[PDB]
C-alpha cells in the first residue's frame, strides 16, 4: 500500500525520459538510413554507334 507505490512513483520520471530518448534514437536511425539511389544506364550514344555499324556506314 505504501512502499512499493512510492518507489514506482520515484521511478516513473527516469523511465519516461529514457524511453523518450530511445524513441528519438529510433527516429534518428530511421532517418540516417535514407539515401537517394542514383542508377547508371547505358548511354544511348553507343546504341546509335552500333546502329550505324548495322547500317554499314
Amino acid at each position: 500500500d505504501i512502499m512499493v507505490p512510492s518507489f514506482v512513483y520515484n521511478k516513473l520520471p527516469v523511465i519516461h525520459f529514457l524511453q523518450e530518448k530511445r524513441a528519438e534514437q529510433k527516429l534518428r536511425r530511421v532517418l540516417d538510413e535514407t539515401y537517394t539511389e542514383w542508377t547508371e544506364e547505358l548511354d544511348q550514344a553507343h546504341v546509335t554507334d552500333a546502329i550505324t555499324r548495322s547500317l554499314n556506314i
Binding site: D43, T48, D49
Partner: protein
Amino acid sequence: RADEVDYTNLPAPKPQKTVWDDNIETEVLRKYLDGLSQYDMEEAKYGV
C-alpha cells in the same frame, strides 16, 4: 647540275577534322559525332 627532286617523296595528305553545326542534335550526339570525326581522320591518314 645538282639534285633536282626526290621523285619518291609524296606530300602526305592533310587530314581535316569534320566540324558539325552546333545544335541540340549535336550535343545529344556529341560523342557519336566525335567518333565519326576520329574515324574519318584515321581513314585519311591510312588511306581507306
